[PDB]
Amino acid sequence: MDTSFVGLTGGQIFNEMMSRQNVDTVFGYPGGAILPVYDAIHNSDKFNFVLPKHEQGAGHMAEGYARASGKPGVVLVTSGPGATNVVTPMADAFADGIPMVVFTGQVPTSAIGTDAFQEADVVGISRSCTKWNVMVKSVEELPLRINEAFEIATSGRPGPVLVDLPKDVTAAILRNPIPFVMQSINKAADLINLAKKPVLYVGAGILNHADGPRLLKELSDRAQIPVTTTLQGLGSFDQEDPKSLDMLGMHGCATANLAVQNADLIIAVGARFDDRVTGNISKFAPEARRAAAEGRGGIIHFEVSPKNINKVVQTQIAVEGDATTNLGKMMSKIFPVKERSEWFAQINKWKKEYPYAYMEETPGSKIKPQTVIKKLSKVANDTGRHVIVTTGVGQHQMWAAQHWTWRNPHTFITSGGLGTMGYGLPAAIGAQVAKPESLVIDIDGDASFNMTLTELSSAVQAGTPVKILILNNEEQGMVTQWQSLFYEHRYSHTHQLNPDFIKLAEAMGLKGLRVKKQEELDAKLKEFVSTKGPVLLEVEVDKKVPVLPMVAGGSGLDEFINFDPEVERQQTELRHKRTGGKH
Amino acid sequence: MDTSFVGLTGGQIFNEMMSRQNVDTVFGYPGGAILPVYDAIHNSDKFNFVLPKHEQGAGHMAEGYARASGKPGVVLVTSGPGATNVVTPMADAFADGIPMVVFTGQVPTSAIGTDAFQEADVVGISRSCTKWNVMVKSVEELPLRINEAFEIATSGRPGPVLVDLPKDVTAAILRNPIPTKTTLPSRAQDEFVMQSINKAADLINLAKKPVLYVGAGILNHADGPRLLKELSDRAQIPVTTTLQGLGSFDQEDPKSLDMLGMHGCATANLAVQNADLIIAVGARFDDRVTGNISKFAPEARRAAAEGRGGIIHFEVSPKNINKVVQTQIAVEGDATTNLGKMMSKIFPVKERSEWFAQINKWKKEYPYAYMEETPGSKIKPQTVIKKLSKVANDTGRHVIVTTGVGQHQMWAAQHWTWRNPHTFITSGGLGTMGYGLPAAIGAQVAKPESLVIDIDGDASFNMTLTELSSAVQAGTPVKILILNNEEQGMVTQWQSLFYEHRYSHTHQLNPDFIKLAEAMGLKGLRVKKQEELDAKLKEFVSTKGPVLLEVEVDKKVPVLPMVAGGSGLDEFINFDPEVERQQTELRHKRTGGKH
């Protein structure tokens, strides 16, 4: 038995447990039910505390922190509204597999089920958006539940867990002492050595191991296999390398999508074949299916969660467990490929004919959002500092993914599964806390920013010099794009009235910069990244600009729509006509 | 069967059902999954659409709208994050009995359970915080589900309901005729209710020290206040209301006891503790009202044991009957309706001289005392409320007050003079900080001619301040008052009292509220000096468009009286200027001079 906790309150035990769990930062907001814990951590030197203005902010900050550090994000909020306010961050973390331990205060056990003040069935509400949750029933089991929580949140596919803490439990004083894969790997190696047009389809899974990108590069080099990544995989592969296919999917480049449709063997590494990547499932990877029917190729899936194997598409070989680990074991079984003339020739043909094209700036026209990303990408890189990027949700998010040059793992923190608008700012703040020395940039949209802009003041109080970039098109761009394309340009409530972003930033205690003219863009971006403290830069960009290429509806990854200058001009005329000149 | 909808999309059917449900306002935010519905309501003149900056804002706006109009608040958001962002507003409406119909877009029925883009098990997540919810599986059942939603939301004890709308269902065209019933919005029992009514009348006619304990329930019927007043006058029964019953009884009436509870006045609490009969009308005996339950209403319990009194409860929901305390008589159904049926059985009372004399001694002895302004001191929050109550009330306009959560909320409750029904819109059960602003916007949409004032706290305001721009876009001239004490007051108060002045993370860094207001497109005003308070309050109230007024108030000031812990309603802590001064000194030492 152990007695190192005897005599301590549940809250004090919590304080100690954070230390034992190597927790160096806690994001939270106090409240009545959780007071016993806040009293115990008052002026605690075991970890730093970050106070947001809204619990949702604490949640997304914790996700940002976890994404940039690899450590679980710890949240501490009160009962009722405190707990319900973190449901979105949990659902978000659940969708993207982010390690997060949410601690929610709860009314006394003697008040549960009586419709008590600020009481909510948090365990029930968060059941579908947590890998596991529980309500601590006594101080004796607090250490155990805390240990199980951290373990579960960081095992298998990382995810969020919730621990409900009744007020009487955290106030209570502890009085008494307390207590085959190899086979798949072999077949996988043979299939690869037998592939004539292989493709590595890499996702976030490869980033869950410090050696992930290293081994990925090793395999790519050894077998000379081109690599394409999902949105969440960006950064795991050097895009400067000739073997990089860039991003695939709904808004991925043509090369990446075509290679996937013509590949005889798809090597899926830490990717779940979500509906934003596969396109029309029945049309997905036609050549791989043909190679599978001929026993000369198909799909190999390195997946840690059995539930995600054969969930979307039938695979030929499944390698269960950590991807990085299994890739290391298979390495030696892989035959060094000299070169793939034909494969690389076809791929390079596509790259030269299908680049991320778009309507560039013309004399007197407004600034193009794509151009802003390309310029900022270079300006940021030229600082020589470690750069981390977060984003909101929408077009600006896709443009950031496409036009930025990814080379470093854990440098792109964006909401993909749930796609939570407002993620940008709080995520950046969290990331900055995790990497104090890094340059953290939040590439945001005006609508997304409006969702959680109150956290600007939190950036100041937390001492996080985040760089907030707002690509202002005065519209919910991603939605208007769908409205333009699928709903005859009927913009139904997709234009919110924006506040003055510069005056807002200043009101919040940040420096505010704005750019309207092309001739001032370069200087503004430079001043932006070189500013010492937190700063916000608003760039007025062109409106109703579609993100291309694009695969939607029943279209296959190869049935994408590409950019065409003449088509854009025709759409503009049609749009003006249908909106009476309003848009 | 009905064939009139054949050929329409689920979205168009939705649009049509709104007018049949008498919906004139919808609060929402677009998204992919809900696009089919948005395209259908594009430029629709069936109703006004209000766009917030965050779904939580749409939810609280809908609540404020519902509280002010008596009509269900309608929310229309997208799947995933759009739906999870309305969980707080739903849980808030569930706790406070607010009618709301939440429509959430959902991924196509064929993608459900596949971890699809922006997919969430919304029906599962909101199960515990809705009176009922459902996922529409086909366009054929859309009309039926909508009708059931509105009926459940507005019947019994009002509350929120959620209707999940798969994208393929709203985009689908109805190709099958459907039952006309699904498209259109006991003697023994009534005899039993009348029996309990007669039994309640007999008990009331026997009472010598009765007290009417009134809550939100009396406000769910237009004639509630009138009938309450009639009974009060007829039987000479003094009236106390919960936080949610404020406005149901004219506080200018001699028989008004003001608010009871944790922070209620001593007169109301003592009256309840000494009454031989407690007549609970539309109130649920929650824990912020009863104090230590074992010490609650000792005289009424003694009267019950002697068969000459006890507790009568006019409750509409079986779930809240005999849930907290044993009652002698429960009168089921709508309180107002039942008071009407009971009236003629109540013996008119000439006077209750002794009972009233005792009550008046308490009123003179325990007013809502506090440390008033002194030379050079900062403005006192309680003083702001008293002054504003008079300025606003004097305009002659219909006034509606919303608030945030905390001390400012309690001071607003205590120091404002309540006289009109549906004029106090506050978050009581869940106590959601950030409620103030969006609720005011929704309330203003419901009542365009009313003077809508949000008495907010600085920390509460920070939660949802982004909705300021929504107020401008919606054209709602709300008056935002921020009693800025640069702290989470209600929490620091508890830390001062129970945690020896250890303020753990209860001081958030505020932005410049005046510059914020201007940046958001509103007029901004600030007051620091006592000498300028009157002028600023007058400018505040007479400004035409939306306006924000920040009042810097004194810090670490406790809300009193206070009944907490194991204390009974009669074991309250009262204001004492000497004790406040000693506590102030103790605080400065303990905090190392930080506070």
Ligand SMILES: Cc1cc2nc3c(=O)[nH]c(=O)nc-3n(C[C@H](O)[C@H](O)[C@H](O)COP(=O)(O)OP(=O)(O)OC[C@H]3O[C@@H](n4cnc5c(N)ncnc54)[C@H](O)[C@@H]3O)c2cc1C
């Ligand atoms: C506006 C918008 C547009 C989008 N457009 C695109 C687009 O065009 N292209 C695109 O790619 N995405 C796009 N997305 C993102 C998309 O929804 C998905 O979030 C993303 O594709 C998922 O990528 P992932 O599978 O790599 O990561 P995850 O969803 O996190 O899935 C990772 C998979 O790896 C497995 N795994 C995890 N850890 C390990 C380990 N240690 N060892 C082995 N296996 C592991 C998991 O359990 C899981 O099956 C978009 C999102 C938004 C908001």
Ligand SMILES: Cc1cc2nc3c(=O)[nH]c(=O)nc-3n(C[C@H](O)[C@H](O)[C@H](O)COP(=O)(O)OP(=O)(O)OC[C@H]3O[C@@H](n4cnc5c(N)ncnc54)[C@H](O)[C@@H]3O)c2cc1C
């Ligand atoms: C900081 C803070 C401090 C607080 N301090 C206090 C305080 O000191 N005093 C206080 O009173 N409250 C206080 N509260 C509010 C408190 O938590 C409860 O929200 C409030 O007391 C509930 O009042 P109610 O019972 O009247 O209304 P509800 O909670 O809405 O309950 C109404 C009851 O009436 C019934 N009913 C509804 N409609 C009808 C009808 N048509 N016919 C018949 N019956 C019906 C319901 O079903 C239910 O049982 C505080 C809250 C906060 C956030």
Ligand SMILES: COc1nc(C)nc(NC(=O)NS(=O)(=O)c2ccccc2Cl)n1
């Ligand atoms: C306004 O009431 C209030 N404010 C704060 C800051 N803390 C509390 N705490 C409280 O009531 N604690 S309690 O644990 O006795 C409790 C009893 C019943 C239901 C819930 C809770 Cl937390 N109250």
Ligand SMILES: COc1nc(C)nc(NC(=O)NS(=O)(=O)c2ccccc2Cl)n1
């Ligand atoms: C960026 O993707 C996006 N953006 C908008 C504005 N709408 C949609 N809609 C969409 O994908 N619709 S779908 O109904 O075919 C769908 C398929 C699978 C899972 C969810 C959804 Cl909504 N997408």
Ligand SMILES: Cc1ncc(CNC(C)CS)c(N)n1
């Ligand atoms: C929080 C939130 N609300 C709404 C949406 C809806 N859809 C988009 C992408 C834009 S208006 C979202 N992605 N996130």
Ligand SMILES: Cc1ncc(CN)c(N)n1
């Ligand atoms: C949303 C929220 N967060 C925190 C608290 C706690 N005092 C509250 N009442 N509401």
Ligand SMILES: [K+]
């Ligand atoms: K790129």
Ligand SMILES: [K+]
């Ligand atoms: K009063």
Ligand SMILES: [Mg+2]
């Ligand atoms: Mg935008």
Ligand SMILES: [Mg+2]
């Ligand atoms: Mg305050």
